[PDB]
Design a protein around this ligand. Sequence first.
Ligand code: JWI
Ligand code: JWI
Lengths: 305, 305
Amino acid sequence: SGFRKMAFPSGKVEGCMVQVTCGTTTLNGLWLDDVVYCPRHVICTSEDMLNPNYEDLLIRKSNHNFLVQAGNVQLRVIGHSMQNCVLKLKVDTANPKTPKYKFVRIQPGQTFSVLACYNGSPSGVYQCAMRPNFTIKGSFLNGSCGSVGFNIDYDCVSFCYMHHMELPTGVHAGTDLEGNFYGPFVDRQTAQAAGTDTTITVNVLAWLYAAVINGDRWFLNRFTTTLNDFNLVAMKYNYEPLTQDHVDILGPLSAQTGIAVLDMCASLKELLQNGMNGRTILGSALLEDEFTPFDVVRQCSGVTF
Amino acid sequence: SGFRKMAFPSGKVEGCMVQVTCGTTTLNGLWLDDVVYCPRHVICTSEDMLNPNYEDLLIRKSNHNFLVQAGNVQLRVIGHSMQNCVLKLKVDTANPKTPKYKFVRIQPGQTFSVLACYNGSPSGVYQCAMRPNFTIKGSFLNGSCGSVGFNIDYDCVSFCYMHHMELPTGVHAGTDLEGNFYGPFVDRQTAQAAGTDTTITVNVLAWLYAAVINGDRWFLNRFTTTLNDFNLVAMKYNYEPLTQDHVDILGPLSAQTGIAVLDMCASLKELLQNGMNGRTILGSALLEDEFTPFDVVRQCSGVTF
Ligand SMILES: *[C@H](CO)C(=O)N(c1ccc(C(C)(C)C)cc1)[C@@H](C(=O)NC1CCCCC1)c1cccnc1
Ligand SMILES: *[C@H](CO)C(=O)N(c1ccc(C(C)(C)C)cc1)[C@@H](C(=O)NC1CCCCC1)c1cccnc1
């Protein structure tokens, strides 16, 4: 029993983190096979950051300008290219620790684990979600640039995020491993504001199922509702609208608890309209929305890797 | 910026987890050097659990009754002994992945990372605290037995917890790596109730410093108080009493924020007496007490390992 903010084990991603220095700037890179992946703004200076032209900045850069260290050893850079907003630095040695892996571009509402790194070394691991405004609410300091977000299905690490920057509001922006940003953000020091941070309704519902599974049932009400009627209340509270796919995805949790999804929606609606009255649910006084219906299943079933 | 429930990187402990089976029962073990550590109730049956005599049960057990697997390989058990509530299984091969390590018995209020395992394989990692009633609020299912809790200072893993059992209230009990339980619990299936779960005051205060550091300042009030006067309000709210050592330990955070500890106490007292008015602090609507004054420092300074 119990229910925690649980991240995947970080070992397989730990053995991938390197340090990339280009002239003055040092951030983290991701070493898979014979390529090192890192944010392209590694080539930027103090002067370049408001308005950088990355192609022009790359003319003045050769293989030997990129210093890549793995622990105490240097790696020889035999080729470099820019794919969207990441640099791919070909090195002459395959990473012997390279795990099985995929690159995947996640949807808003999906969760992943972040291994926060500084100077190529890991500091800690934690779980977060791609928000519907395509930010993530991370824990990142200067130099965390190039840390990666990932899921693990059994043996296979599917990397889904690379950390690029912090916005003035303290939230975080980044790219997939092909260098395409999530949402509208760009790797320049220019006014960039997040859109509305709406709540991931399906994730809230899945977390409510996890509470029932753990014995926290006081919020189970005597009502049901409809998809259309719930969404009227949801949009008023800046909840993401619930779809039939969301219902279908909650099916396994429906089945395990004996509680129909639409009944769970009426319970959520009552919690939204009346508050939590200083009670808690699974140790929280907020409706937690960063657990997916696969997250609860895994944690409440013990799926290993 | 940002502030998350951050665990240490789990890689070094991952490479230590094995599977221990004794007759019918299978749980996790910890393989450091040529010894495997695991909970002694691995030798218990369905019939033994209300009242087991572990010495009598050990008479009927020899080296070859303990099946220890690391992945797909078996380890040869050349000797076994019981130290308090753990078994130490001497095997004929040193773990080549053995990290630098210490065994430490933590104090209530201290935090650590848990690598939750099933059948010797890791499922996820998360952070928790030794509560003042000597329970921990974990995420553990059947078979998680033998998972370990740990801190990492740079290169050195100091293991501090091994998971033994769940109490009927859904919280968790366990031992240090010498097999002495935390608090009064015993490895039998018998009525065991937790004492009062009081709040770790110093950890709440440290978390308030982390909010200020991150820009969340609305709770900074216009008061100060004294140690004695704060504790009058603290004991009413089942907060642990604050000492001068707690003050001294908060000193680095005092210095970094410009906010005296005793002023921070008056702010906490106001939050305790008046509530949070539906506001949040660092994304929480509860006063979070599972971050120590070393935790905030590390996360708000980027200490790597
Ligand atoms: C990256 C490693 O130095 C880094 O920490 N970082 C950052 C700096 C500069 C950029 C440019 C794209 C502008 C070159 C990108 C990332 C900082 C950061 O994001 N600072 C921004 C700069 C613009 C205004 C808001 C803050 C950083 C700090 C903490 C966490 N992540 C990133
Ligand atoms: C250990 C691995 O099987 C395990 O999960 N577990 C457990 C069972 C039995 C014991 C004895 C000491 C009684 C032999 C210890 C641990 C269960 C568990 O703790 N069940 C208890 C048994 C007594 C009443 C309350 C539940 C477990 C389940 C989830 C998380 N941790 C442990």
